[PDB]
């Protein structure tokens, strides 16, 4: 609803909110504007 960068609505509207393959209360991981350092991306060689 807002311009929040990490704000993306958990459990959105009338749709059930499940593929039937996850079928649990665990989807979220929706916060955390940051991810860890990547060891298989572009700079993988330098980190390794």
């Amino acid at each position: 609803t807002d311009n929040n960068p990490e704000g993306w609505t958990l459990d959105k509207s009338v749709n059930n909110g499940t593929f039937a393959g996850l079928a649990e209360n665990g989807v979220t991981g929706l916060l955390q504007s940051g991810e860890p350092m990547d060891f298989s991306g572009a700079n993988a060689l330098y980190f390794w």
Binding site: E6, G26, T28, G29, L30, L31, Q32, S33, G34
Partner: protein, 48 residues
């Protein structure tokens, strides 16, 4: 131990409740069952 820990900051009148199942895919296991091992639950830059 999914989504077991959670911070709930209380604002002047409101409150905003974030749970780790919405932040981390890393879970500190109860193993190493050997005693007195403590665990850590890091939260990523909670722009509250």
């Amino acid at each position: 131990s999914s989504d077991d820990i959670s911070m709930e900051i209380e604002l002047n009148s409101t409150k905003f409740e974030t749970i780790t199942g919405s932040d981390v895919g890393l879970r500190p296991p109860l193993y190493p069952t050997v005693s007195r091992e403590t665990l850590a639950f890091p939260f990523g830059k909670l722009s509250i």
